[PDB]
């Protein structure tokens, strides 16, 4: 590794920890009702996700390099990485024991939970991703680097794409270096395995969009914030 890369990684791990979970206030401010036990688990999932996206933007905004981009490209990258980066946040709260996700309120959500909320269509693939990630024993630094790498990805309608790509390069170099150091039994293979996650994220992200559109079939309304940032109306 290199004295500078360790600095970058220290920084990323820090930011990752700083924005892992939302405020006590913001969370409690959610569970406060009216409709049945179904439209409730749905409101929790959607509302908490809003905080989740907010946290993602906070993390991205502070990544070295972000401030060197045009406002327009910043918006583009953030819009595009939301649905993807959240899969990481989800995987990090996956419990192998119960094959579930530990939400903020410690309430573990499972297939049944999502199903009850009207989102049983994709939960299987979601849990599958969590297991995949888990089996790879991805650590904090790897997750942080990977998140940065996802955020600085070539996306359509990008003005200074080349500028994004150069920034991504720095994080890719950091990742490789970090992996060579701690991972020896085929470092380069683990490196490729981690990058393969990016390609799988295109699929999960696409599924998220498909599900959002499907909420219209049912009579579920996606919170405006989410519907907007993900352009789930086109």
């Amino acid at each position: 590794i290199s004295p500078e890369q360790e600095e970058l990684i220290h920084r990323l791990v820090y930011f990752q920890n700083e924005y892992e979970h939302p405020s006590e206030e913001d969370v409690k401010r959610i569970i406060n009702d009216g409709e049945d036990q179904c439209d409730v688990r749905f409101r929790h999932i959607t509302e908490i996700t809003i905080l989740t996206v907010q946290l993602i933007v906070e993390f991205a905004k502070r990544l070295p390099g972000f401030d060197k981009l045009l406002r327009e490209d910043q918006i583009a990258l953030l819009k595009a990485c939301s649905s993807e980066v959240m899969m990481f946040r989800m995987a990090r709260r996956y419990d192998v024991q119960t094959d579930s996700i530990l939400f903020v309120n410690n309430q573990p959500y499972s297939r049944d939970s999502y199903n009850l909320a009207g989102m049983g269509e994709t939960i299987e693939d979601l849990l599958h991703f969590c297991r995949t990630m888990y089996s790879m024993r991805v650590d904090n630094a790897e997750y942080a680097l990977l998140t940065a790498i996802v955020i600085f990805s070539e996306r359509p309608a990008l003005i200074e794409g080349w500028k994004v790509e150069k920034i991504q390069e720095i994080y890719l170099e950091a990742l490789r270096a970090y992996v060579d150091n701690r991972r020896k039994p085929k470092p380069g293979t683990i490196f490729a395995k981690l990058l393969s996650v990016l390609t799988e994220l295109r699929t999960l992200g696409n599924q998220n969009s498909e599900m959002c559109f499907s909420l219209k079939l049912k009579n579920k309304k996606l919170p405006p914030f989410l519907a907007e940032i993900w352009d789930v109306d086109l």
């Binding site: 990805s153 890719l172 490729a192």
Partner: protein
């Protein structure tokens, strides 16, 4: 076991390179054959290629069918994207037949055109991606242990990891001057997956003669 030779070979045995015939957008019942021919060759080369990849045929028949059905589009898009590096501003098929923004509808494609050219062709072009690299990436695409319905999961995961190592090794020795080369190659896969997701049907499967379910067309092609 993963021989880098076996891989370079499979991509070679299918190495297409003949004319540079622009497609004719007419019902001269000839273009229907130029397209039909390009199709048949493209799809035959797809299975022909897969069988030449190390240990593919050693997989359960059902599994090699699932793997091709799943990777079909990505595999093809990668194929015609790489041999489209020569074309000035167009996509090159197997027949040597080429398509353009306007002559894109027939032959599927169409709305993946702009994106294919800008995120794959141009990228591969300015990166000087060679057939060996392509061969490894396509093989990586093929050995997706996460494809559903697959039995030999772990077997596939291992074969894929071996290809990572081969490509990792190949790039370090071929470009000791370009460290990012490895990562730069692998980062073409997300773009490729995104474009493939925009498809909705298996590319070129309808320009094929007569009717026959996908799993069947594959099942017999893998036996012939």
């Amino acid at each position: 076991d993963m021989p880098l030779e076996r891989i370079i070979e499979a991509e070679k045995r299918v190495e297409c390179n003949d004319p540079l015939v622009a497609l004719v957008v007419n019902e001269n019942n000839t273009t229907v054959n130029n397209i039909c021919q390009a199709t048949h060759k493209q799809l035959f080369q797809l299975v022909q290629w897969a069988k030449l990849v190390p240990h593919f045929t050693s997989l359960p028949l059902t599994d090699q069918v699932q793997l091709l059905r799943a990777g079909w589009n990505e595999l093809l898009i990668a194929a015609f994207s790489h041999r489209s590096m020569q074309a000035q501003d167009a996509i090159v098929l197997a027949t040597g037949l080429t398509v353009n923004k306007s002559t894109a509808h027939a032959v599927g494609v169409g709305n993946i055109y702009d994106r294919v050219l800008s995120e794959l062709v141009n990228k591969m072009k300015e990166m000087k991606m060679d057939k060996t690299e392509l061969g490894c990436l396509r093989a990586i695409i093929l050995y997706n242990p996460d494809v559903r319905g697959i039995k030999s999961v772990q077997e596939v995961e291992m074969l894929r990891e071996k290809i990572y190592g081969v490509l990792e090794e190949y790039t370090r020795t071929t470009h000791p001057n370009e460290p990012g080369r490895f990562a730069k190659l692998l980062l073409r896969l997300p773009a490729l997956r995104s474009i493939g997701l925009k498809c909705l049907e298996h590319l070129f499967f309808f320009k094929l003669i007569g009717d026959v379910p996908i799993d069947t067309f594959l099942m017999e092609m893998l036996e012939g």
